[PDB]
């Protein structure tokens, strides 16, 4: 019974996670497939605004 | 922690991954991002040049300040000389 509508919102989450598994696999993909970013700008950044104040 | 709580988590974490992933590839693809991105990403390289022009302007003055000082120096050693004797 109760134990019925349990097993549907079990049934439920696991679709909401292999949703959620589909949008990040498109994304994954329409970036493997075009070719900077912003990850080491930071880096450069903080190398820079620490020897402008050392200089 | 209990099992519901790590429930929670685990959706945020698929779901922050996801925001992630899509940031990467709106920065990666979209051009309007992709513009201010590479502006910046350029002039780093101008303001990293901006720098060694800085370094040697530097190491410059300085050498200035030490000749500026030496003259001082031997300026107050010919006028202590004539101080002391007229």
Redesign the interface.
Known sequence: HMEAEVDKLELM?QK??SD??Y??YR??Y??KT?????VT?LK??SV?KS??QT? | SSDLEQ?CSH?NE??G??KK??S??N???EPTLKTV??K??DE?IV??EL?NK??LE?QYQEQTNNSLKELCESLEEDYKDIEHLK
């Open positions: 989450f909401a996670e959620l598994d949008i990040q994304l994954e329409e970036i075009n070719h900077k970013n912003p700008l450069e950044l820079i020897r402008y200089l | 429930l959706v698929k779901i991954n996801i992933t899509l990467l590839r920065c990666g693809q991105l590479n910046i990403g780093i303001i990293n720098l800085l370094e530097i």
